[PDB]
Design an enzyme around this catalytic site. Sequence first.
Site, short mmCIF file in Angstrom:
data_model
loop_
_atom_site.label_atom_id
_atom_site.label_comp_id
_atom_site.label_asym_id
_atom_site.label_seq_id
_atom_site.Cartn_x
_atom_site.Cartn_y
_atom_site.Cartn_z
N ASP A 31 0.72 -1.78 6.99
CA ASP A 31 1.00 -3.05 6.35
C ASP A 31 2.36 -3.61 6.72
O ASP A 31 2.49 -4.77 7.09
CB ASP A 31 0.88 -2.93 4.83
CG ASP A 31 -0.54 -3.05 4.34
OD1 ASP A 31 -1.47 -2.92 5.18
OD2 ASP A 31 -0.74 -3.29 3.14
N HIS A 45 -4.60 -0.22 3.57
CA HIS A 45 -4.14 0.58 2.44
C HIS A 45 -2.87 1.37 2.78
O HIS A 45 -1.98 1.52 1.93
CB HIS A 45 -5.24 1.54 1.97
CG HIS A 45 -6.49 0.85 1.53
ND1 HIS A 45 -6.80 0.65 0.20
CD2 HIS A 45 -7.51 0.31 2.24
CE1 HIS A 45 -7.96 0.02 0.11
NE2 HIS A 45 -8.41 -0.20 1.33
N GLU A 62 3.41 1.42 -1.49
CA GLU A 62 2.15 1.89 -2.07
C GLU A 62 2.48 2.66 -3.34
O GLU A 62 3.37 3.51 -3.35
CB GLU A 62 1.38 2.76 -1.07
CG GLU A 62 1.06 2.08 0.26
CD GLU A 62 0.16 0.86 0.11
OE1 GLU A 62 0.17 -0.01 1.01
OE2 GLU A 62 -0.57 0.79 -0.90
N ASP A 120 7.08 -2.85 2.59
CA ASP A 120 5.82 -2.70 1.88
C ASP A 120 5.87 -1.42 1.06
O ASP A 120 6.64 -0.51 1.37
CB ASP A 120 4.63 -2.67 2.83
CG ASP A 120 3.31 -2.44 2.11
OD1 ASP A 120 2.92 -3.32 1.31
OD2 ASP A 120 2.67 -1.39 2.34
#
EC number: 3.1.13.-
Lengths: 205, 205
Positions: free
Chosen positions: A181, A176, A20, A18
């Site tokens: 995640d 978030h 961000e 994952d």
Amino acid sequence: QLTGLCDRFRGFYPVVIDVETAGFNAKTDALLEIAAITLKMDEQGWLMPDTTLHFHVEPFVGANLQPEALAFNGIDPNDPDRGAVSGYEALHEIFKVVRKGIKASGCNRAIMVAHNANFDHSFMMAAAERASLKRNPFHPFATFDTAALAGLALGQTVLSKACQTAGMDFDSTQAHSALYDTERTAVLFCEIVNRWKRLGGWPLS
Amino acid sequence: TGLCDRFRGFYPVVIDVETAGFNAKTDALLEIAAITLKMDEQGWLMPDTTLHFHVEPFVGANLQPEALAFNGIDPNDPDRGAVSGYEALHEIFKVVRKGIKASGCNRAIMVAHNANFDHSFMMAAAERASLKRNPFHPFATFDTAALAGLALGQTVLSKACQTAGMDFDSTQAHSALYDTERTAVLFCEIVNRWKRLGGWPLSAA
DNA sequence: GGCCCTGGCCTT
DNA sequence: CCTT
Ligand SMILES: [Co+2]
Ligand SMILES: [Co+2]
């Protein structure tokens, strides 16, 4: 007869990812943080998370920092004690363990597992490029998309609703965050794959 | 029950695309095939409609020799039966947009092998034709490459079909029409095979 | 951010 | 290897 992981995915070595970011442009937008979770398989043939990594990355010089992306993930690139690193550093580290994990498994090539995978896969490759990284153990265009898999197994595309329908507990407000995640994702995959085995879907007969 | 209830309101459309290269922005579209899906009363998934088109490369298009040698398509052949990229999609959208209203779905979702590729190329084509009201999801796709990895433990389309107990004629592999049909049959297969083992409905079990 | 609809879906 |  075939217990091993290598046999389950034609020799592919599924690593969960994952990411961000500071926007949606893999080329122009900054990679803020990345988490990676390798998988393992037992002798009963069951799938489960193996080793876990995560890094806060400092935006590549010249990178864009879209305000809303920051509003969403609540990240602050400016924060001094962030303990961030260079895209290279994270990726270099993530790869070496993946390669190390491939040899152990007896696999031939790693493949990224991610929710709406292309997005993450897109950012990673772009990050390796900027980093001039080479020997990348991931497949250049093949991905296991948890959004699509959840659509088949659970009838849900969203990560939230998928995790909830599958019987998992999913804290949306913690979502978030990268490490959370990658964790909720990795487990999903394992639950999807394992339930498949339970219903007699695997082996193929 | 019903198609609409199977994928949280999505209308799955199967697609294979034949191109001039790998760049979705620069290279050309040469062939496009599309197949909408339906579900019988028992809840079985089968092919409903089939469309295929030969595409005239857009002005300014890049035509990679390496590619054309792979698929063996002759773009300048006037006996190709080629139409404008606009004409092909406007006919597909017309068919897709209507199947969605028929099944009470909300919008379409592209089913393809390594779906991103086709999706990348189709969206770029829609942009060229400046087409509007695109029924498809901006970024969500069912990748049969991954789905086959779960169901059949195979990633390659030909093996995914073969190992799924299907016929695959590598002789017709460069035809969007044949390719798509082989894909829909594989997707309806995987989806249906799930129902057989009681994987769906979820509650019933 | 990049397409839906008259901001809201999502991988941020 | 195997989406052109
Ligand atoms: Co970087
Ligand atoms: Co066109």
